[PDB]
Amino acid sequence: GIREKIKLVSSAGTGHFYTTTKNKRTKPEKLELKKFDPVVRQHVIYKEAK
Amino acid sequence: XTXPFXX
Amino acid sequence: TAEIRLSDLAKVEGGVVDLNTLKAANIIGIQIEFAKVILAGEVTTPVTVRGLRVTKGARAAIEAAGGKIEE
Amino acid sequence: TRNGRDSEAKRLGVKRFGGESVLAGSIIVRQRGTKFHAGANVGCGRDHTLFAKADGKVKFEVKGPKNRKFISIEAE
Amino acid sequence: PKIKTVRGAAKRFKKTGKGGFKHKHANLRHILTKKATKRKRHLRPKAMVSKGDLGLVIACLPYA
RNA sequence: UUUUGUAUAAUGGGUCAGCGACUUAUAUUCUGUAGCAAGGUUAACCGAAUAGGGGAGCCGAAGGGAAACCGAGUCUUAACU
RNA sequence: GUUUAUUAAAAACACAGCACUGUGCAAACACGAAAGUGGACGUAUACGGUGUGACGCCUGCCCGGUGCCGGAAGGUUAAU
RNA sequence: UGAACUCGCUGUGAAGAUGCAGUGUACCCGCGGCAAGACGGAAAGACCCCGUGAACCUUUACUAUAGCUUGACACUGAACA
RNA sequence: CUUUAAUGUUUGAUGUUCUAACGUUGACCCGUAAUCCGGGUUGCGGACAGUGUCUGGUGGGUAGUUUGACUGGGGCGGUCUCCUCCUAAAGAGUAACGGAGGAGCACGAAGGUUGGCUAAUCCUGGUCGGACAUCAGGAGGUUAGUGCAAUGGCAUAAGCCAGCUUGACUGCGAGCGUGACGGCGCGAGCAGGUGCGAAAGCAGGUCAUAGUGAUCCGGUGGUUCUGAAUGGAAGGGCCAUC
Numbered sequence: 001g002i003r004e005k006i007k008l009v010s011s012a013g014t015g016h017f018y019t020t021t022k023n024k025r026t027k028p029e030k031l032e033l034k035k036f037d038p039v040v041r042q043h044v045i046y047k048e049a050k
Numbered sequence: 051x052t053x054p055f056x057x
Numbered sequence: 058t059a060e061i062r063l064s065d066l067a068k069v070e071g072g073v074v075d076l077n078t079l080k081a082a083n084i085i086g087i088q089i090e091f092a093k094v095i096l097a098g099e100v101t102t103p104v105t106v107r108g109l110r111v112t113k114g115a116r117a118a119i120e121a122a123g124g125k126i127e128e
Numbered sequence: 129t130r131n132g133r134d135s136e137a138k139r140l141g142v143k144r145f146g147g148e149s150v151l152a153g154s155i156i157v158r159q160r161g162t163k164f165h166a167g168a169n170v171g172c173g174r175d176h177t178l179f180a181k182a183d184g185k186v187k188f189e190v191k192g193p194k195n196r197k198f199i200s201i202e203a204e
Numbered sequence: 205p206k207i208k209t210v211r212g213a214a215k216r217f218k219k220t221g222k223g224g225f226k227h228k229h230a231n232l233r234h235i236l237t238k239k240a241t242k243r244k245r246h247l248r249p250k251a252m253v254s255k256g257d258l259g260l261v262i263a264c265l266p267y268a
Numbered sequence: 269u270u271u272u273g274u275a276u277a278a279u280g281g282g283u284c285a286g287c288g289a290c291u292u293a294u295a296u297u298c299u300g301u302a303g304c305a306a307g308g309u310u311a312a313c314c315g316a317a318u319a320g321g322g323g324a325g326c327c328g329a330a331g332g333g334a335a336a337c338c339g340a341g342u343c344u345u346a347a348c349u
Numbered sequence: 350g351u352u353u354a355u356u357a358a359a360a361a362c363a364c365a366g367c368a369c370u371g372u373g374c375a376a377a378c379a380c381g382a383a384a385g386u387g388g389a390c391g392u393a394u395a396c397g398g399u400g401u402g403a404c405g406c407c408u409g410c411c412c413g414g415u416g417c418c419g420g421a422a423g424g425u426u427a428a429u
Numbered sequence: 430u431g432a433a434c435u436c437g438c439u440g441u442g443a444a445g446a447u448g449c450a451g452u453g454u455a456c457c458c459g460c461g462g463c464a465a466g467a468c469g470g471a472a473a474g475a476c477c478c479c480g481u482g483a484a485c486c487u488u489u490a491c492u493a494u495a496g497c498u499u500g501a502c503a504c505u506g507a508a509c510a
Numbered sequence: 511c512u513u514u515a516a517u518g519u520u521u522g523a524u525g526u527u528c529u530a531a532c533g534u535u536g537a538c539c540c541g542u543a544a545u546c547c548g549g550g551u552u553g554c555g556g557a558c559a560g561u562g563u564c565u566g567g568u569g570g571g572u573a574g575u576u577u578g579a580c581u582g583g584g585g586c587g588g589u590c591u592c593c594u595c596c597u598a599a600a601g602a603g604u605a606a607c608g609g610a611g612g613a614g615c616a617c618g619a620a621g622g623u624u625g626g627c628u629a630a631u632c633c634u635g636g637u638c639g640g641a642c643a644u645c646a647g648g649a650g651g652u653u654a655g656u657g658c659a660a661u662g663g664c665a666u667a668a669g670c671c672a673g674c675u676u677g678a679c680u681g682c683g684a685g686c687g688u689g690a691c692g693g694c695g696c697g698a699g700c701a702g703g704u705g706c707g708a709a710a711g712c713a714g715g716u717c718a719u720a721g722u723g724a725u726c727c728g729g730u731g732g733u734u735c736u737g738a739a740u741g742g743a744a745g746g747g748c749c750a751u752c
């Protein structure tokens with residue numbers, strides 16, 4: 001079904017992560033977003049995008 | 051069991 | 058692990074509440090290694106509690122009854 | 129091409145009629161479009177559910193040059 | 205002979221203060237990514253067994 | 269008897285007599301009843317043997333939490349209006 | 350010739366004949382956890398299995414599939 | 430073989446009536462005969478469907494397995510290229 | 511390195527013999543007036559064969575089972591979850607092998623917000639240029655558009671474009687809808703922390719309604735909550751996820 005599951009991991013120490021999908025087959029660039037990290041309790045940067 | 055009663 | 062009532066403790070005979078004593082007075086269980094005293098029931102005679110975790114309540118209750126709580 | 133299908137009914141409709149006294153947050157209508165629009169003290173959720181925002185009595189109105197149905201919540 | 209406990213029930217239901225049963229929600233085990241954060245959040249806390257199910261639960265736990 | 273429905277041309281019985289189908293054990297809950305009551309009761313055993321002894325135990329007077337643990341509170345959450 | 354003893358005697362089974370194929374004998378094969386025994390006191394002009402069914406005139410084309418037979422270099426591949 | 434004081438017709442009716450309604454007919458009881466009816470007797474329908482029934486039988490259904498076959502180790506040693 | 515070639519090391523390996531384990535369903539001797547068996551002698555084989563344990567393959571020979579349900583009998587065909595409309599009798603709901611269709615995805619922008627914008631169709635004119643391409647005007651007034659089926663919505667746009675962006679936030683949640691249940695949906699508001707806006711304010715994904723799979727078992731990360739003498743550890747729990 002093409003679209004593929006990926007995790008966004010917290011740029012902070014905290015091993016926290018969010019979880020989503022993407023069309024690797026067209027948007028191969030890793031995915032970087034600002035998301036709230038509830039361990040540091042601060043909007044930090046999230047990375048990786050499988 | 052063999053058609054007519056009782057052949 | 059067991060819990061003890063203020064209502065007990067005035068019934069160990071030998072105003073000193075500790076594991077083997079409660080046990081003797083048949084209120085906890087021969088194999089209990091740990092016991093707490095809860096704020097349940099009233100406490101009347103003063104009494105001494107040795108080696109037993111004690112809730113805030115129970116402490117007030119016991120201390121008001123002129124008793125001591127020596128961990 | 130072979131029929132036979134249909135989908136579970138969605139229990140859409142009016143949940144509280146005019147005059148009904150509701151507590152805040154209470155759904156007044158499950159609708160699909162906005163047959164009714166949120167008026168005073170009435171909210172509009174995603175599916176276009178209209179809900180109450182204050183405790184009061186469900187009022188139905190027709191307001192405006194478009195003549196649109198509105199649901200509001202007056203204090204009792 | 206003692207009634208025997210449906211041992212799988214005893215791994216899923218716990219009897220509480222007023223005599224009811226708490227139990228874990230269903231749907232937080234996997235296939236998580238698509239489920240709304242809201243949805244999952246209200247599934248975390250435990251819940252009471254329904255009126256219509258106490259018959260069944262209780263049948264499975266004589267010694268609860 | 270079974271059926272939506274049987275005088276039914278649907279089932280069973282030739283007739284009489286005797287016999288023939290919801291029990292028993294242990295658990296468990298509930299009702300009723302008796303006892304004692306924040307207590308209630310003892311098992312095996314002992315025995316002066318339906319007595320008496322035996323409180324080992326079990327249930328109940330505390331819950332909340334997965335748990336550590338805290339406790340008339342506890343969990344949830346950094347915290348809860 | 351045989352057969353459904355008791356609803357089928359037949360065109361069914363057997364049959365001499367034919368063809369394949371297995372078998373070097375402690376045979377193949379078969380009854381047996383085994384010992385032992387049939388095959389056979391036989392030995393490839395023998396013994397087993399399979400099909401076809403006197404005889405006459407004959408029995409063509411196909412080996413992709415499925416079975417079987419042969420192969421050894423690669424590939425894949427068990428316990429160890 | 431439930432019990433019978435056991436007729437026809439047309440209707441009706443769990444829908445093919447000696448027994449229901451209407452009506453017709455018929456004095457009581459045998460014997461010899463016939464088989465149109467008593468959905469006549471016999472046998473809890475073999476067809477058909479159903480039961481998360483049974484059994485055999487088949488196969489490139491599943492799962493196992495005797496047998497057959499492969500190697501490793503053991504019984505299993507020695508001396509030479 | 512493109513690919514070969516000359517000793518090794520041992521190690522098996524294919525190999526050569528030996529005999530002494532082992533086979534002999536050759537001959538002989540004795541127990542024996544015995545085609546068994548045992549011992550002995552010899553001949554022939556020989557570490558092979560064969561057997562035990564482990565192991566791949568084969569294995570209807572045997573065995574145990576499976577081989578769905580709905581259905582105007584059954585079978586064939588078709589159907590089995592979900593979404594939309596009608597049947598549905600102006601609240602909800604409502605059957606048929608009734609009538610018609612669609613889903614099992616997509617999007618990091620096609621999400622958020624601030625600002626801005628407004629179709630379809632027809633006529634007239636206009637290079638290539640045509641019934642229809644792009645341009646201008648008038649009519650028109652949403653008949654357009656909305657990732658997609660239908661329905662209901664949509665101009666204050668939910669339609670269209672740009673900038674800045676990650677609220678497609680984490681913890682919760684008064685109070686409701688809908689379910690036999692499992693569960694599913696709506697939700698203001700609160701706390702932390704965000705983006706857009708001068709501000710009021712908006713944002714907990716997408717106009718809404720399909721786009722889905724319980725539980726067990728297991729994987730990954732986090733987290734000392736647990737830790738069977740003690741300290742650790744395994745394993746378990748808890749949270750995220752597959």
Ligand SMILES: CCN(CC)CCS(=O)(=O)[C@@H]1CCN2C(=O)c3coc(n3)CC(=O)C[C@H](O)/C=C(C)/C=C/CNC(=O)/C=C/[C@@H](C)[C@@H](C(C)C)OC(=O)[C@@H]12
Binds near residue numbers: 053054474475476
């Ligand atoms: C050509 C004439 N035939 C056709 C097959 C008439 C019937 S038959 O004799 O051949 C045979 C027995 C009854 N059958 C019916 O079909 C049947 C149909 O309706 C009825 N029976 C109604 C009745 O007659 C019920 C009666 O009370 C009961 C009976 C007579 C059943 C007896 C049992 N016989 C069988 O089961 C035989 C079954 C096989 C032979 C089937 C074949 C189709 C396979 O035949 C019948 O059932 C046959």
Ligand SMILES: [Mg+2]
Binds near residue numbers: 083
């Ligand atoms: Mg005791």
Ligand SMILES: [Mg+2]
Binds near residue numbers: 232233
């Ligand atoms: Mg989990």
Ligand SMILES: [Mg+2]
């Ligand atoms: Mg009937």
Ligand SMILES: [Mg+2]
């Ligand atoms: Mg009647």
Ligand SMILES: [Mg+2]
């Ligand atoms: Mg009758």
Ligand SMILES: [Mg+2]
């Ligand atoms: Mg009659």
Ligand SMILES: [Mg+2]
């Ligand atoms: Mg009878």
Ligand SMILES: [Mg+2]
């Ligand atoms: Mg015969």
Ligand SMILES: [Mg+2]
């Ligand atoms: Mg004959």
Ligand SMILES: [Mg+2]
């Ligand atoms: Mg031959």
Ligand SMILES: [Mg+2]
């Ligand atoms: Mg023939």
Ligand SMILES: [Mg+2]
Binds near residue numbers: 446
């Ligand atoms: Mg009649």
Ligand SMILES: [Mg+2]
């Ligand atoms: Mg008549």
Ligand SMILES: [Mg+2]
């Ligand atoms: Mg007569």
Ligand SMILES: [Mg+2]
Binds near residue numbers: 473
């Ligand atoms: Mg029958």
